[PDB]
Amino acid sequence: SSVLASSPKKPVSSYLRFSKEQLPIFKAQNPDAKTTELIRRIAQRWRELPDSKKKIYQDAYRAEWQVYKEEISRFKEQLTPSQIMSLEKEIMDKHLKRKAMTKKKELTLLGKPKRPRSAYNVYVAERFQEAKGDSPQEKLKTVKENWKNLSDSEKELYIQHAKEDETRYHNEMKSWEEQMIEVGRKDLLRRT
Amino acid sequence: WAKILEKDKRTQQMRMQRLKAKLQMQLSGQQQRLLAFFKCCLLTDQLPLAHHLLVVHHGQRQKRKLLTLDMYNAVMLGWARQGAFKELVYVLFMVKDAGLTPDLLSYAAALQCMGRQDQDAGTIERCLEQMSQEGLKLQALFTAVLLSEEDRATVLKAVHKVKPTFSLPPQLPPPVNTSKLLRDVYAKDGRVSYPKLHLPLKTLQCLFEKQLHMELASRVCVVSVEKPTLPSKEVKHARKTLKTLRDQWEKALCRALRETKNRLEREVYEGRFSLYPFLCLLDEREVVRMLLQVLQALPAQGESFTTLARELSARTFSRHVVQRQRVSGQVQALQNHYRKYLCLLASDAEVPEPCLPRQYWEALGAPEALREQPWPLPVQMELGKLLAEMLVQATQMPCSLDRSSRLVPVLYHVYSFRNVQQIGILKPHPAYVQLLEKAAEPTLTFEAVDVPMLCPPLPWTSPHSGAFLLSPTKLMRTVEGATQHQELLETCPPTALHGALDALTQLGNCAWRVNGRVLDLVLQLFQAKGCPQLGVPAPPSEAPELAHCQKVAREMHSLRAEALYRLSLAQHLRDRVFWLPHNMDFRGRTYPCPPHFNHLGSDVARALLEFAQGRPLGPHGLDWLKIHLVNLTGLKKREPLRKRLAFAEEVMDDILDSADQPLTGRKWWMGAEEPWQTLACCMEVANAVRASDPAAYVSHLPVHQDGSCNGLQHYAALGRDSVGAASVNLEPSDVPQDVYSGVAAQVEVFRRQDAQRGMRVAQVLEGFITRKVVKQTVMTVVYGVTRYGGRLQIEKRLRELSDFPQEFVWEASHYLVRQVFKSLQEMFSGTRAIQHWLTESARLISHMGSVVEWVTPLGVPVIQPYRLDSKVKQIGGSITYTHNGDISRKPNTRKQKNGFPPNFIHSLDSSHMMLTALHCYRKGLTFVSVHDCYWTHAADVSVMNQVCREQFVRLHSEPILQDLSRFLVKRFCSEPQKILEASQLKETLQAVPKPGAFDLEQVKRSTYFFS
Amino acid sequence: KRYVTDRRLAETLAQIYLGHLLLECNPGPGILTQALLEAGAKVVALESDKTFIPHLESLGKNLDGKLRVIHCDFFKLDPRSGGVIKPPAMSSRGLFKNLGIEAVPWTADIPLKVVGMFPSRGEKRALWKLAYDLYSCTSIYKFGRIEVNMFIGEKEFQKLMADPGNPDLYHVLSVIWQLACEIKVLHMEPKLYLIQMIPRQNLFTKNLTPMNYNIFFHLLKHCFGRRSATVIDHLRSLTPLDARDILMQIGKQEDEKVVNMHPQDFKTLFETIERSKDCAYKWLYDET
DNA sequence: CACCGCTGCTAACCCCATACCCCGAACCAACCAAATTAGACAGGCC
DNA sequence: GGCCTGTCGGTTTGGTTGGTTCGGGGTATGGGGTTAGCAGCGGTG
């Protein structure tokens, strides 16, 4: 039930066709080379290819573009009365979703200093490995139970290191946020 | 745990490396936008932004071409003002990288950065010798370059380090105008008795402080005259709701403003231009208060989107200039300079030598602060559209009006298709209108520029310095061709304009005050029940099939509004003394700047005002007050002065009765032609006759002397036409010569011929040719041919003739104009010769693709602005408002040819009025001018008439037609190709009509020349 | 101008109109007039050019019956905001009074028939003028549902008959005339289309009357000012009522486009807005 | 005061990407076209 | 030169033209990155 999947797609251009046909051969002759290097050498092959040879791929692409014109026209004509409305809905949604995904990947790529670790986080980091349990969830519940059974004295080191990581996070946040001010991104600073 | 901690540290350092990698990776409309952007960024001190955009444009192949040496000079001057030597050097690197040649402004910026940074004498010397090898001039820098006082100070500090005895040219010795007619005005040889004001120095300083405060606030709050009372609950609730809504609009407007500034800011972070810095030019609170003011004052019917944009742009520019002067120290220098200037006007202060206000002002300094050039039109339009759209989008209100969950925009734009071209209209919500109506706000707000000044205006020292102290005011009103006329006003010699500047300064220095009684009565009628018979609008309660009733209602509402504003300002200025600065049109005619309240208004307006400084009547004061009274009544227009005085003596009882009981007595004044002015003159005459000594009564009422058909007077003077000189009272006579009666008779004979021929209009106009009809008609054809501003007025005067079929009023007005033209050209053949000569000459000049230009006998250059076919349009998401750029392609030959004679006559009458004003000022008389009317105190009416006639004879005594002919010949008969059109043009220009026999000197003995 | 000069076309037209009093516009040479007279029609010729009057009158003198020749330019009758000062321009009240034509109720049948050809360069102008007169119940339509048969150019014909099925030509005149009259093609002369326009008996309703048509015209021009925008966008600038609510009342979705609205959809829109009950005001119309 | 989401951890499993070129789509500055209608002189075209 | 025709902040919207940037099109297995489970809490509204 996806109109976009059945919509006629653009034909492959000349160069992209040459690469689409050459790639399997380069892969057969160099099974262990990384795809990066193979695509690079294929692009060099295309640059070295005489223009008279590229002309063939270009003509094929042009015919494929005519047949694509006919196909896309027929498909546009085939849809229900609100064909233009449905095309606008699907295109708009596609664009907004694409921009959103790009922004999410951007925000994920950034490198903000990790938040402070709590005493519970420290205890889990120190005792999880030796905690018995068949799975990470069961070992995490074990660490949780042993933590709930811990006394106030047994937790002093974890709480101390937790405070130290609070100060560390404070300083690193100061410096990092300053550098972000240098980059003109004062929106990422702490609100108050 | 050092394992995890060290892992975090290592990842942090790698992230730092990633951060290092990220750090590693012919004028035109668009050109005008960019340049205005940089120049604007210099004022907000956002140099990194402008430098960023400039670098981006320079780095792109297709964008580098769009940059200009002036822009690089802008950024460079910014860095020099900031002392960024490295960045300035970088900008210089861009300038050399893109070829082109650095200029005086470039080297001045460099010198500024070195002086501010105190560079070594080796680098300074090397810079001065590289400047010498480049051929640039040291003294041309301080003169040809526009720099602030801080730039000048820093450059001087840098120069005094190598050349301590380096001195700028000795200044500033001002030159005197040697014009033929102004020589005796500026020559020291002569006894001057310049008048002084009645207010003391400290008083003038207090008033100056009040005016300065008012202009700094940019707003004026005046109390509403009338209808304060209202139902107690309704006004209460409506006021509470309006206040809450205004707070909500204030907050929402602040938020929307900040969000918009952020949007534009990010748009500048992108490679696109935006008005960000312009929005950063004025305080956000001032912007919000301005928009809220415009919203409060928006007319219920709506306003043109484009017009609103223009208004917002104008107020933004004004408040920005005010802010710049406020923070640049120009305010204090203006306080000191003006406080010294007040010595010439103050009564208890003397000056070393007598001089005119402009002369003294320039003598004290004259730094004149700094001149700021306005923004390009596309920037003004885009800014207006931004502000308007932001206001509409931000202002919301509930629809429930009198449980208001739903929200609708307060402003909604609709479209008018009356014009074949749809026009955008901004209309307010009807519920909002009803809310403001029920609230009955008892306060009105005016722009500081729309109300009279509380102190003597600034003397006109140049085409860019005048009128209100801080707000910039154009020397010439005419918007069409403003670039041409302004640039020529600055091109002409500074001395050439001395006369006009001194005349406007004199007009502005006239002290005015309000007539308490007249205001009390006019309000009494307005406060209760209007009096349309006496020009007092009636409230909507008196509005009267449905279509006509609605029409009359709308007209009555318009008049009611205008009267509300005028009378409101009058009440605000009741107990204060105020001055009205004057301006000029492209023709030279002077007009008051404050439009709402000024002496150029209607009868009521003229009666509300009187001279603040008095003048003892003297031996003829009373006689002139009575004669003036009769003139205002219009009962003895044809009678001589002596019989007008005798008539005043006869109806003296009706004068006293009318003055004592205006609304309860015999109400004789209500029957006069000018009822309110007649009443005021009756009160003045009563105070004079009832005084212990009438000859010593300090009279404040101005007396008027008007030139009947001043234009025909000028034409009769040019051609020495005896028939004209007699018709228009140029030739002395004991009885007034009414040219309207003779022309009415001739036109009556023509109407007898055509009516004999069976024409319908000629048959219907039988018995309607009267002095007033032909007076306004001739007043039209002379001063106006086409452009039916006054012609509509004549249609009105005919519509007020009940016994006339209104179907022909239009055709009857056209026929009347044509017959007046023909008749005047028949009885005044010489006048027709001059008119045809000027009209034809203008036709030929315009036919060559050049507008008609000339120079008045006082050295004022006049240029006709009629051009056509310039247009360009922006598009804000989405109306597309058009704009008329200043680049003209071809002149409008028709308007030029039809307009040249009338405009020239306007320059002649304006020159005459100016000469009369100056020479009367030498004798200590108070002089103001309304169209053709000359006003003065009853004690000096005779003297004013003397100066009038003398200056008229002196004016027309010169070869105006000859000098004009030779002028047009030299200016327009110089094209080497083609020479044929220059030969026919010269052939027509050298065909100056031969003057008549009339002896101009007779004007000195003509009693009724001006009466 | 345009003149009927072919005898065959004159005969075909005569038989068509015969298919009552006939008002013939701009007969010119009088070929169609003579064809009608020979066919037995009672003809009143409104000739704008006086030079054609003699021969025409001659034809009348040949029949010497009830034919009547008047020097009148039909397209100049009752000038809007005019002083009534022209021979060719006249008053339909006076003309019909002289011709003995009496007004009949709107619901009554067609009292008279007018035939002619639109000006070669004034088709849009004539259509607008006639639209104003009809919706205002003025001019000829003051006497009833006058049947108007007129030759028109092919472009203005297609634009007039266009609708959402052919959006590129759909426009205000299309809506107005398709709602006002039942238009039918009577003949096509190569191309010129002889269109028959008969006012609909049910044009006026309780909420669409000769008293409020101006507001509807304002709405139409307003919407067609930006034909690509959505109907709700324009409505937000036309009424204080909930635009979404109104559009929903007329059974349209929020994404409904202007060009997708049928003439009856516009009519039901206007009548629906006028019908609104719980509002202090319904329209924002304030224009001279 | 309540509400978010990021750390502490794992897990195996799920999910996007550098080398490259070709040309169709698409975003600016500018000119132009449309909609609409009720008697003299000067300009434009032949 | 002679004859015929148009006329006494043109409005905003949008359609074509000359340019120039932007991205969708082809991909592979290898690497990352991912919801579930439980507690704690800095940061935000």
Residue type, A191: R
| Listed residue (B510, B199, B512, B209) closest to B349, CA to CA | B199
Q: Tell me the C-alpha to C-alpha distance, in Å, between residue B766 and each of B752, B756, B769, B795.
A: 8, 11, 7, 17
Q: In what order do the strands lie in the sheet with B928-930?
A: B703-706, B933-936, B928-930
CB spacing of B18 vs A184 below 8 angstroms? no
The CATH classification number of C213-275 equals: 1.10.8.100
Task: Specify whether A64 is located in the same domain as A128.
Answer: no
- CB-side exposure of B162: number of CA atoms within 13 Å? 18
8 Å CB contact of B414 and C221:
no
CA distances from B464 to B270, B329, B405 (A): 38, 19, 53
Q: Which of residues 34-53 of A touch strand E (CB under 7 A)?
A: 35-36, 39
Q: Compute the distance between CA of residue B772 and CA of residue B769 in angstroms, rounded to an integer.
A: 9
Cβ of B8 and A184 within 8 Å? Answer: no
Q: What share of chain A is helix, strand, coil (3-state, %, to 5)?
A: 75, 0, 25
Instruction: Dig out the tokens for B956 from the structure.
Output: 């027309």
Is residue A59 within a helix (H) or strand (E), and if so which, with residue range? helix A51-78
Q: How far apart (Å, rounded) are the C-alpha atoms in residues C3 and C29?
A: 7
Choose among B487, B485, B446, B454: nearest CA to B584: B485
In a shared domain, residues A71 and A126? no
**Has residue A66 been placed in a domain?**
yes
The residue type of C208 is L
C261 to A79, A88, C172, C251, C255: CA distances (angstroms): 20, 19, 12, 11, 12
| CA-wise closest residue to C150 among C191, C198, C114 | C114
Q: Where are the domains of chain C?
A: 7-199, 213-275
Cα-atom radius of gyration of chain A, to the nearest Å?
A: 29
Q: CA B894 → C1' D41, Å? A: 10
Task: Residue C212: list chain B partners with CB under 8 A.
Answer: none
Of A111, A161, A179, the CB nearest to B18: A111
DSSP letters of C193-262? Answer: EEEEEEE-TTS--SSS-TTTHHHHHHHHHHHHHTTTSBHHHHHTTT-SS-HHHHHHHTT--TT-BGGG--
| Alpha-carbon distance C223 to nearest alpha carbon in chain B (angstroms) | 10
CATH architecture of B201-456: Orthogonal Bundle (1.10)
Place of tokens 């005569």: C14
Q: How far is the CA of B893 from the C1' of E3 (A)?
A: 22
The tokens for B824 are 């005047």
Q: Distance between CA atoms of B134 and B137, rounded to whole angstroms?
A: 9
> Chain D bases under 7 Å from protein CB?
6-11, 16-24, 28-32, 34-38, 42-43
Beta-carbon contacts of residue B1000 (< 8 Å; ≥ 6 apart): B717, B720, B953, B956, B957
- Asked if the Cβ–Cβ distance from A111 to B1 is below 8 Å, we say no
**Is the bond preceding B366 in cis, omega lying within 30 degrees of 0?**
yes
State the smallest CA–CA distance between residue C109 and chain B in angstroms: 31
Select from B8, B11, B258, B266 the residue whose CB has the most chain A CBs within 10 Å, as the one to mutate to test that interface: B8
CA distances from B826 to B180, B185, B822, B823 (A): 36, 40, 6, 5
CA–CA separation, B452 and B474 (whole Å):
17
Q: Residue B753 and residue C75: Cα distance in Å, rounded?
A: 36
Q: Is residue A60 part of a domain?
A: yes
Is B12 in contact with A125 (Cβ distance < 8 A)? no
Q: What are phi and psi of B440, to 5 degrees?
A: 50, 60
Element (H, E) at B415: strand B411-416
Q: Are B295 and B395 in contact (CB under 8 A)?
A: yes
Q: How far apart are the first and last CA of chain A?
A: 49
Chain B CB within 8 Å of residue C8 CB: no
Among A176, A177, A185, A186, the strongest candidate for a mutation testing the B interface, having the largest count of B CBs within 10 A, is A176
DSSP-based three-state secondary structure for B703: strand
- The Cα–Cα gap between C100 and C107 comes to 21
Q: What are phi and psi of A13, to 5 degrees?
A: -70, 175
Complete DSSP assignment for B302-322: -EEHHHHHHHHHHHHHHHHHH
Q: CB distance from B698 to chain C under 8 Å?
A: no
CA atoms of B333 and B320, how far apart (whole Å): 18
What is d(CA B103, CA B101) in angstroms, rounded to the nearest whole number? Answer: 6
User: Residue C86 carries which side chain, given as an amino acid letter?
Assistant: K
Which two tokens mark C262? Answer: 């049928």
Burial A126-160 (b: 16+ CB within 10 A, else e): ebeeebeeeeeeebeebbeeebeeeeeeebeebee
Q: What is the DSSP letter of C110?
A: -
Query: What is the rounded distance in angstroms from the CA atom of residue B963 to the CA atom of residue B957?
Result: 12
Q: Method used for this model?
A: X-ray
Please indicate if any CB of chain B lies within 8 Å of the CB of C278: no
User: Alpha-carbon distance C124 to B766, whole Å?
Assistant: 43
CA distances from C43 to B714, C59, C67, C144 (A): 65, 11, 5, 19
* d(C-alpha B703, C-alpha B627), whole Å: 9
From residue B784, give the alpha-carbon distance in Å to each of B28, B711, B791: 38, 11, 8
Would you call B415 and C83 a contact, using CB atoms and an 8 Å cutoff? Answer: no
User: Residue A150 CB closer than 7 angstroms to strand E?
Assistant: no
Residue A38 domain-assigned? Answer: yes
CA angle, B956 then B962 then B965, to 5°: 130
The type of residue at A69 is K
Q: Which residue is nearest to nucleotide E8 (CA to C1')?
A: B786
Q: Where are the alpha helices (DSSP H) in B671-788?
A: 675-689, 710-718, 722-727, 739-757, 760-764, 771-783
Measure CB to CB from residue B4 to each of A125, A179, A184 and give the nearest one: A125
**Cα–Cα distance for residue pair B92/B69, rounded to 1 Å:** 10
Whose tokens are 């309006």? That residue is: B242
Which residue in C85, C240, C288 is closest to B807 by CB distance? C85
- Which is nearest to B655 in space by CA: B682, B684, B674? B682
Distance CA B383, CA B309 (A): 7
Residue nearest to nucleotide E11 (CA to C1'): B421
Chain A contact partners (≥3 CB pairs within 8 A): B
Rg for chain C, CA atoms, rounded: 21
Q: Which long-range contacts (CB under 8 A, 24 or more apart) does B812-819 make?
A: B812/B761, B812/B764, B812/B765, B815/B761, B815/B762, B815/B765, B816/B747, B816/B765, B816/B773, B816/B774, B816/B777, B817/B777, B817/B780, B817/B781, B817/B791, B819/B747, B819/B750, B819/B751
Q: What angle do CA B809, B815, B818 make, to 5 degrees?
A: 140
Helix (H, G, I), strand (E, B) or coil at B642: helix
- Comparing CA positions, the residue from B461, B456, B469 lying closest to residue B363 is B461
* Chains A & B: contacts with CB separation below 8 Å: 11
Contacts of C215 in chain B (CB under 8 A): none
Q: Which of residues 55-84 of A touch strand E (CB under 7 A)?
A: none
State the Cα–Cα distance between residues B905 and B786, nearest whole angstrom: 16
- Report the distance from CA of residue B272 to the C1' of nucleotide D6 in Å, as an integer: 37
The H-or-E segment that residue C267 falls in is: helix C263-275
Mutation target vs C (from B393, B405, B415; most C CBs, 10 A cutoff): B415
| Helix %, strand %, coil % of chain B (to 5) | 60, 10, 30
HEC per residue, B202-236 = HHHHHHHHHHHHHHHHCEEEEECCCCCCCCHHHHH
Answer left, alpha or beta for residue B806, where phi above 0 means left and psi between -120 and 50 means alpha.
alpha
Q: Which nucleotides of E are covered by protein (CB under 7 A)?
A: 8-14, 19-21, 24-29, 33-34, 36-45
Q: Identify which of B239, B257, B250 has the alpha carbon closest to the alpha carbon of residue B295.
A: B250
Please, what sign has the CA dihedral across residues B686, B692, B695, B701?
negative
Give the list of residues 6+ apart from residue B136 with CB closer than 8 angstroms, or none: B103, B104, B107
Domain made up of B512-706: CATH architecture: Orthogonal Bundle (1.10)
Closest nucleotide to the alpha carbon of B306, via C1': E9
Contact of C103 with C144, CB cutoff 8 Å: yes
- Compute the distance between CA of residue B941 and CA of residue B945 in angstroms, rounded to an integer: 6
- Using DSSP, state whether C153 is helix, strand or coil: strand
Separation CA B952–CA B74 (nearest Å):
52
* Shortest CA to C1' contact from C80: nucleotide: D38
Cα–Cα distances in angstroms (integers) from residue B875 to residues B394, B417, B757, B878, B879, in the given order: 20, 20, 59, 7, 6
Does A86 fall in a domain? no
Containing structural domain, residue A10: 3-78
Please report residues of B whose CB lies closer than 8 A to that of C222. Answer: 414-415
Could you tell me the distance in Å between the CA of residue B79 and the C1' of nucleotide D3?
49
**CB-to-strand E under 7 Å, chain B 406-425:** 419, 421-424
Contact: A172, B12; criterion CB under 8 Å = yes
Q: Which of residues 17-46 of A touch strand D (CB under 7 A)?
A: 19, 35-36, 39-40, 43, 46
3-state secondary structure of B861: strand
CA B406/CA B430 separation, integer angstroms: 16
Q: Which two tokens stand for residue B368?
A: 């004149």
Q: Which amino acid is at B556?
A: M
Overall number of domains in chain A = 2
CA-to-CA separations, A172 to A112, A158, A178, in angstroms, rounded: 9, 21, 10
Residue C69 annotated as binding site: no
Q: Report yes or no: B871 and B846 within 8 Å, Cβ to Cβ.
A: no
Q: How far is the C-alpha of B606 from the C-alpha of B593, rounded, in Å?
A: 16
- B807 secondary structure, DSSP code: G
CB-based contact B439:B238 (threshold 8 Å) = yes
SS3 of residue A32 by DSSP: coil
Gyration radius from chain B CA atoms: 33
Residue window 13-52, chain B: list those with CB within 8 Å of chain A. Answer: 15, 18-19
- In angstroms, the first-to-last Cα distance of chain C is 34
Strand B928-930 with B933-936, pairing:
antiparallel
How many residues are present in chain A?
Answer: 192
Is the residue at A62 inside a domain?
yes
Show which of residues 218-277 on chain B sit within 8 Å of chain A, judged by CB atoms. 269
C86 class by beta-carbon count within 10 Å (0-12 exposed, 13-18 middle, 19+ buried): exposed
Task: Please say whether the beta carbons of B602 and B675 come within 8 A.
Answer: no
Using an 8 Å Cβ cutoff, are B751 and B818 in contact? no
Task: Kindly list the domain boundaries of chain B, sorted by start residue.
Answer: 26-162, 201-456, 512-706, 722-827
Does C225 contact B399 at a Cβ distance shorter than 8 Å?
no
- Alpha-helical regions (H) of B25-165: 29-44, 47-59, 61-64, 69-82, 85-97, 104-117, 121-133, 138-144, 149-162
Give nearest nucleotide to A122 (CA–C1'). Answer: D8
C-alpha distances in Å from residue A143, one per residue of A137, A149, B777: 10, 10, 107
Using a CB–CB cutoff of 8 Å, tell me whether B595 touches chain C.
no
Q: In this structure, is residue A65 part of a structural domain? A: yes
Look at residue A111 and tell me if it is in a domain.
no
Q: Which residues of B touch C237 (CB under 8 A)?
A: 412-415
Helix axes C172-180 and C154-161, enclosed angle (nearest 10): 70
Distance to chain A for B480, nearest Cα, Å: 46
Whether the beta carbon of B786 falls within 7 A of nucleic chain E: the reply is yes
Give residues with Cβ within 8 angstroms of C59, minimum separation 6.
C30, C33, C34, C37, C67
C7-199, which class in CATH?
alpha beta
Closest alpha carbon within chain A to B15: A111
Judged by phi (left if over 0) then psi (alpha if -120 to 50, else beta), residue B216 lies in alpha
Residue bearing tokens 């208060």: B289
Q: Which of residues 83-122 of A touch strand D (CB under 7 A)?
A: 105, 112, 114-115, 117-118, 120-121
Closest C-alpha among B805, B983, B1000, B791 to residue B912: B1000
As to burial, measured by CB atoms within 10 angstroms (0-12 exposed, 13-18 middle, 19+ buried), residue B528 is exposed
